[PDB]
């Protein structure tokens, strides 16, 4: 009958792992909690609010490199931040779908101001710092979203033979599956950082 | 009572725009088609197969730069391909969620072999060509997925004031919204291409 933040978020993350993001509804959560829906409303007004709370919790638990570390290079900060963000998105079933569209709350503002102060002090324009961080965020989401979906689709589709593909495509696809999700993420992340370096050197 | 590819895919893309990807089911489609479900089964065995057909159709209609164009530079090919892919993902409601996890069929193999032949003839290793294309694909998906979700979330959440944010975050967020989806996509795409150039120059 009684709720608080921690009770509602712990039950919701277990439900997310049991049923996935489409399966998750405020009604199913109230039931798992053994509470009536109007008690739950004061804590999560709707699905959207629930998703946002769950995305923030996953970052609070697993996003260890949210903020720059003294005395990291900007390149190491961007790589570590992306890796940490990725770990948060992979922490739960459909975690990156949970994260899409999330807004910062006031408790992240200090962190997010420090990221920008740090990059601009490294020589980035404000605009270039914003889009370096945006590009890292969009590439990391895309990466995890595509990974997480192939995983789901395999219960649902005939598993494809590569035998009949033409030679370069066969070799590329077999190599992409062989090396797996983390090497593809690290290769793209490195290409982004190299591009940021090139653009920064110009500018100044 | 009668089906063929075009009838089923046209009705399904209109239903996608009416109800979005979660709203789309094979049963609701059979109803819109005025057909019984076993007739539909021979054309789409389940949701997964339906999604895959819809993702391929959106590329067949809107992905104009699927293949390299003679005599494009590799940088122009990668930029144009990404822009064309983006247009396909934006063509319908939830289009990028439709595209997640899609597998090529045999009719794309020629196209996809030509992309790789083209990049390796430009001096890429097979591995580096594969992950340049992967990184462009993941960044573009991420970009569109995040855009498409903020759009949805606005019917569902109090629209946030930036007034109380600290000065760099306030300026960055206001600038990201001001310039909009396409400039953020183009900035990330350009950073990727610059990074590819840097890595290619090394190598050889």
């Amino acid at each position: 009958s009684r709720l608080d933040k921690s009770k509602v978020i712990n039950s919701a993350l277990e439900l997310l792992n049991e049923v996935g993001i489409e399966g998750l509804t405020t009604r199913k959560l109230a039931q798992k909690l053994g509470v009536e829906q109007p008690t739950l409303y004061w804590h999560v007004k709707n699905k959207r609010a629930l998703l946002d709370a769950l995305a923030i919790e996953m970052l609070d638990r697993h996003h260890t490199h949210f903020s720059p570390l003294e005395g990291e290079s900007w390149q190491d900060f961007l790589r570590n931040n992306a890796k940490s963000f990725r770990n948060a998105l992979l922490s739960h079933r459909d975690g990156a779908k949970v994260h899409l569209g999330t807004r910062p709350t006031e408790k992240q503002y200090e962190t997010l101001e420090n990221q920008l102060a740090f990059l601009t002090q490294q020589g980035f324009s404000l605009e270039n710092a914003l889009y370096a961080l945006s590009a890292v965020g969009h590439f990391t989401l895309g990466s995890v979203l595509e990974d997480q979906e192939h995983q789901v689709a395999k219960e649902e589709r005939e598993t494809p033979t590569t035998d009949s593909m033409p030679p370069l495509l066969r070799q590329a696809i077999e190599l992409f599956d062989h090396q797996g999700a983390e090497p593809a993420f690290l290769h793209g992340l490195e290409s982004l950082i190299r591009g940021f370096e090139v653009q920064l050197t110009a500018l100044l | 009572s009668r089906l063929d590819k075009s009838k089923v895919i046209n009705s399904a893309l209109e239903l996608l725009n009416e109800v979005g990807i979660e709203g789309l089911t094979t049963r609701k489609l059979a109803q819109k088609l005025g057909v019984e479900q076993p007739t539909l089964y021979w054309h789409v065995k389940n949701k997964r197969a339906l999604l895959d057909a819809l993702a391929i159709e959106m590329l067949d209609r809107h992905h104009t730069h699927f293949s390299p164009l003679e005599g494009e530079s590799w940088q122009d090919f990668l930029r144009n391909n990404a822009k064309s892919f983006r247009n396909a993902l934006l063509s319908h409601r939830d289009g990028a969620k439709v595209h997640l996890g899609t597998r090529p069929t045999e009719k794309q193999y020629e196209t996809l072999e030509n992309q790789l032949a083209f990049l390796t003839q430009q001096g890429f290793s097979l591995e580096n060509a594969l992950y340049a294309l992967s990184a462009v694909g993941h960044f573009t998906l991420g970009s569109v997925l995040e855009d498409q979700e903020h759009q949805v979330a606005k019917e569902e959440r109090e629209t946030p004031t930036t007034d109380s944010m600290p000065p760099l975050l306030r300026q960055a967020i206001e600038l990201f919204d001001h310039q909009g989806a396409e400039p953020a996509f183009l900035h990330g795409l350009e950073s990727l291409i610059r990074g590819f150039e840097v890595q290619l120059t090394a190598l050889l």
């Binding site: 992306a82 948060a88 910062p104 961080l133 990391t140 989401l141 | 007034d163 990201f176």
Partner: peptide, 12 residues
């Protein structure tokens, strides 16, 4: 409030 935005970058 004076200013609102309708699109945000990913949070991380």
């Amino acid at each position: 409030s004076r200013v609102v935005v309708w699109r945000l970058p990913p949070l991380h």
